[PDB]
Design an enzyme around this catalytic site. Structure first.
Site, PDB file in Angstrom:
ATOM      1  N   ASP B   9      -1.687  -0.401  10.386  1.00  0.00           N
ATOM      2  CA  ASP B   9      -0.578  -1.316  10.154  1.00  0.00           C
ATOM      3  C   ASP B   9      -0.393  -1.655   8.682  1.00  0.00           C
ATOM      4  O   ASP B   9      -1.201  -2.385   8.110  1.00  0.00           O
ATOM      5  CB  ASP B   9      -0.804  -2.649  11.010  1.00  0.00           C
ATOM      6  CG  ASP B   9       0.394  -3.470  11.002  1.00  0.00           C
ATOM      7  OD1 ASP B   9       0.482  -4.374  11.816  1.00  0.00           O
ATOM      8  OD2 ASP B   9       1.381  -3.146  10.226  1.00  0.00           O
ATOM      9  N   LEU B  10       0.602  -1.100   8.094  1.00  0.00           N
ATOM     10  CA  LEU B  10       0.812  -1.236   6.628  1.00  0.00           C
ATOM     11  C   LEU B  10       1.298  -2.633   6.289  1.00  0.00           C
ATOM     12  O   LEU B  10       2.243  -3.154   6.954  1.00  0.00           O
ATOM     13  CB  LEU B  10       1.799  -0.197   6.141  1.00  0.00           C
ATOM     14  CG  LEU B  10       1.099   1.028   5.646  1.00  0.00           C
ATOM     15  CD1 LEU B  10       0.086   1.431   6.603  1.00  0.00           C
ATOM     16  CD2 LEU B  10       1.938   2.174   5.449  1.00  0.00           C
ATOM     17  N   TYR B  14       8.035  -2.356   3.036  1.00  0.00           N
ATOM     18  CA  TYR B  14       9.108  -2.094   2.039  1.00  0.00           C
ATOM     19  C   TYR B  14       8.743  -2.716   0.722  1.00  0.00           C
ATOM     20  O   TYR B  14       9.083  -2.160  -0.381  1.00  0.00           O
ATOM     21  CB  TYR B  14      10.422  -2.769   2.494  1.00  0.00           C
ATOM     22  CG  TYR B  14      10.995  -2.200   3.813  1.00  0.00           C
ATOM     23  CD1 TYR B  14      10.491  -1.176   4.433  1.00  0.00           C
ATOM     24  CD2 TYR B  14      12.171  -2.804   4.353  1.00  0.00           C
ATOM     25  CE1 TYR B  14      11.063  -0.695   5.635  1.00  0.00           C
ATOM     26  CE2 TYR B  14      12.768  -2.317   5.561  1.00  0.00           C
ATOM     27  CZ  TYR B  14      12.166  -1.300   6.155  1.00  0.00           C
ATOM     28  OH  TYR B  14      12.763  -0.796   7.370  1.00  0.00           O
ATOM     29  N   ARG B  46       4.833 -14.635  -0.061  1.00  0.00           N
ATOM     30  CA  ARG B  46       4.626 -15.077   1.307  1.00  0.00           C
ATOM     31  C   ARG B  46       3.990 -16.465   1.295  1.00  0.00           C
ATOM     32  O   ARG B  46       4.442 -17.378   2.025  1.00  0.00           O
ATOM     33  CB  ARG B  46       3.715 -14.092   2.028  1.00  0.00           C
ATOM     34  CG  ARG B  46       4.104 -13.730   3.427  1.00  0.00           C
ATOM     35  CD  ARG B  46       3.035 -12.901   4.188  1.00  0.00           C
ATOM     36  NE  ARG B  46       2.448 -13.768   5.230  1.00  0.00           N
ATOM     37  CZ  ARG B  46       1.367 -13.521   5.984  1.00  0.00           C
ATOM     38  NH1 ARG B  46       0.683 -12.396   5.844  1.00  0.00           N
ATOM     39  NH2 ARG B  46       0.948 -14.427   6.882  1.00  0.00           N
ATOM     40  N   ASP B 101       6.254   1.377   9.991  1.00  0.00           N
ATOM     41  CA  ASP B 101       5.009   1.008   9.388  1.00  0.00           C
ATOM     42  C   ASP B 101       3.763   0.885  10.253  1.00  0.00           C
ATOM     43  O   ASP B 101       2.778   0.395   9.771  1.00  0.00           O
ATOM     44  CB  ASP B 101       5.135  -0.259   8.519  1.00  0.00           C
ATOM     45  CG  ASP B 101       5.537  -1.487   9.359  1.00  0.00           C
ATOM     46  OD1 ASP B 101       6.071  -2.513   8.798  1.00  0.00           O
ATOM     47  OD2 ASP B 101       5.291  -1.475  10.611  1.00  0.00           O
ATOM     48  N   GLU B 102       3.776   1.457  11.457  1.00  0.00           N
ATOM     49  CA  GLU B 102       2.625   1.446  12.325  1.00  0.00           C
ATOM     50  C   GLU B 102       2.378   2.822  12.947  1.00  0.00           C
ATOM     51  O   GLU B 102       3.323   3.568  13.260  1.00  0.00           O
ATOM     52  CB  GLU B 102       2.838   0.373  13.413  1.00  0.00           C
ATOM     53  CG  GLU B 102       2.708  -1.043  12.945  1.00  0.00           C
ATOM     54  CD  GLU B 102       2.935  -2.107  14.072  1.00  0.00           C
ATOM     55  OE1 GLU B 102       2.446  -1.984  15.260  1.00  0.00           O
ATOM     56  OE2 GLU B 102       3.517  -3.117  13.774  1.00  0.00           O
TER      57      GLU B 102
END
Lengths: 367, 367
Positions: B9-10, B14, B46, B101-102
């Site tokens: 899981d990146l 983006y 974040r 992305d997974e």
DNA sequence: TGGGGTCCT
DNA sequence: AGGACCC
DNA sequence: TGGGGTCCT
DNA sequence: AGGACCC
């Protein structure tokens, strides 16, 4: 780019299969029946009025001398059907089934492989086997005529082998695409074959009397074509691409208009093993409701054995219905471990029944 | 029967891809935006409140120091996505994508091939790489613990190679099925990995706060579960199989109930090349009507190039819409010869438009 | 609440 | 064709 | 108007 | 799930 396709069409197929099982029916006019219908009859009967899909009564009062056999149970017909296909597969691998009694075979590679094998010599001695569609003259110097003739030779060998090995007769038609091969296979109806040369394509397609006779044009598009004034094949050829485009939608329209010129680029597709196995009961008034899952135990029993046999296992179940065109289904996965008997299956069929003139089970999505 | 699956899981994908393109954003809190949304942001941002899918304004007034980049054009993200997958494919061929992305990889054969290669000796020296889910003790004599540890070693190598070869960080989770691997990959959030031992399965699944958090349970089944009183994972585990069976239908029900115990038999499926390529425009009020086929020339232009490239050719076109959950499409075949530029394509898109807050073209059914 | 994508009925 | 799921 | 079967939207 | 086609 050009192809040589043969369409193989077995004569009154269930009646042949029954006539092989009981030879005391050979001379006698034979109807195979399902519920109230005579779905097929051999030659003897056909000639005395019996036809297509008549009543066991409107058909008996057009011929009292009628023998009837029940052909609701499709098992033996289904087995002979695949024997036919496997036999054509051995000539050339790419064979497409259409119902139980028709097959298309793409003969293109095989015709060429024969042609390369001849010396510039015996080529002038190539002949046709069977009829030439509109009694058209053959031109031995036309490479398309030569290929089609060699295709009519393969066809006659398919028919001889079908007869010698399986005891079945049938018709064949050889042409340059599937539309035309299937149109021309039935020109000489009982146990004969016809080859279509390119120059007679318009003759064949204009010999049709209504556009519903073109394979690919069904009950529903024909009624829509009518509503537009379109009735003959020539009306369809000459109709505005635009209006038809804008009215049956680009896909249906630009496809059935080509068909109306005899043009049809769709490949013969390899059918191989079936994508599903289903069984049905008919009965008008008869399913009260809930109690008639009993029904549901039988189609299963039958199916289970068949599903078994093939080897491959179904991963989807389906149940179908009508009440008093419109049928309903509910599908669900088949629980993994129950893949690898009846018991839990009936159960998952019985909520598939409760979330919800006839009933059926389908095993789909085999693996 | 038992498997070792890794879920990769990146992190803020983006934003990583943009941070590689413009390094002056590395220290700076970075939002990637699409229309009015901030779809993703790197770590720096974040932490100062920016989140999930906030407003370019409700998100700027929770952080004025925000850098924004436009990520409406998915091209570079899509390319790096497949670079990641191809890289995991080289470890073991069976890799499944989930969005850009997974990836899931079934490591079972590879873990066993390593285990057979060790002598009864170094086996006692097998160690874990990364975190053990609930700080659980490892038992070196438990064959399932040993396999999962070797799986956490493959995982760490996937992450090192993803970093060394592509410059991307990310998380991984190792467990015995895809549900659990994906649940446990996010326990240590930024660029770390976790392995789940069997004894902590119930701990992980009961750490969830609502059943919508179980992958496979969506927006709609969650609202139906609610209507039934079902809110915690434990309510779902203990709920009547019958009622749920009879209420979401046997398939959905007997599947999400297993999931609520951490049980999930679904295989990692090989994704290989994409089944379709589509592009979209968003715009609320903006498509008057007819005039906005211009729109329709662009998604095409973009798509055509992409479709090209892959090599394989699309045989189906589709157009999609919404007006002011509910979207509409019309599909049609792509005319054979036009397979082998724009011109006739726009045209067939323009009756697909006329038979009929946003617009899209899809190329499907590649060959 | 974008801009993709997959499988099932 | 449309629904339902995932990111 | 049976008792099958296939592909598309 | 349902429509449309063929035998």
């Amino acid at each position: 780019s050009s192809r040589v396709i043969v369409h193989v069409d077995l004569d009154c197929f269930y009646a042949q299969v029954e006539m092989i099982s009981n030879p005391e029916l050979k001379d006698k006019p034979l109807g195979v029946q399902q519920k109230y219908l005579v779905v097929t009859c051999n030659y003897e009967a056909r000639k005395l009025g019996v036809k297509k899909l008549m009543n066991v009564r409107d058909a008996k009062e057009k011929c009292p001398q009628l023998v009837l056999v029940n052909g609701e149970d499709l098992t033996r017909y289904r087995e002979m059907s695949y024997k036919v296909t496997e036999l054509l597969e051995e000539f050339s691998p790419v064979v497409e089934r259409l119902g139980f009694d028709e097959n298309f075979v793409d003969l293109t590679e095989m015709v060429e492989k024969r042609l390369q094998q001849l010396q510039s010599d015996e080529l002038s001695a190539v002949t046709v086997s069977g009829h030439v569609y509109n009694n058209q003259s053959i031109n031995l110097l036309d490479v398309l005529h030569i290929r089609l003739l060699v295709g009519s030779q393969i066809a006659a060998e398919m028919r001889e082998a079908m007869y010698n090995q399986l005891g079945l007769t049938g018709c064949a038609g050889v042409a340059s695409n599937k539309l035309l091969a299937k149109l021309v296979s039935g020109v000489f109806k009982p146990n004969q074959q016809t080859v279509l040369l390119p120059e007679s394509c318009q003759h064949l397609i204009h010999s049709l009397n209504h556009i519903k006779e073109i394979p690919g044009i069904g009950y529903k598009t024909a009624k829509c074509l009518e509503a537009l004034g379109i009735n003959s094949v020539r009306d369809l050829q000459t109709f505005s691409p635009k209006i038809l485009e804008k009215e049956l939608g680009i896909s249906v329209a630009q496809r059935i208009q080509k068909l109306s010129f005899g043009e049809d680029n769709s490949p013969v597709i390899l059918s191989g093993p079936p994508q599903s196995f289903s069984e049905e009961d008919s009965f008008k008034k008869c399913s009260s409701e809930v109690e008639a899952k009993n029904k549901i135990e039988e189609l299963l029993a039958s199916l289970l054995n068949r599903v078994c046999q093939d080897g491959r296992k179904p991963h989807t179940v389906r149940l179908i219905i009508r009440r008093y065109y419109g049928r309903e289904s509910r599908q669900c996965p088949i629980p993994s471990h129950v893949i690898q008997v009846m018991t839990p299956m009936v159960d998952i069929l019985m909520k598939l029944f409760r979330n919800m003139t006839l009933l059926s089970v389908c095993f789909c999505n085999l693996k």
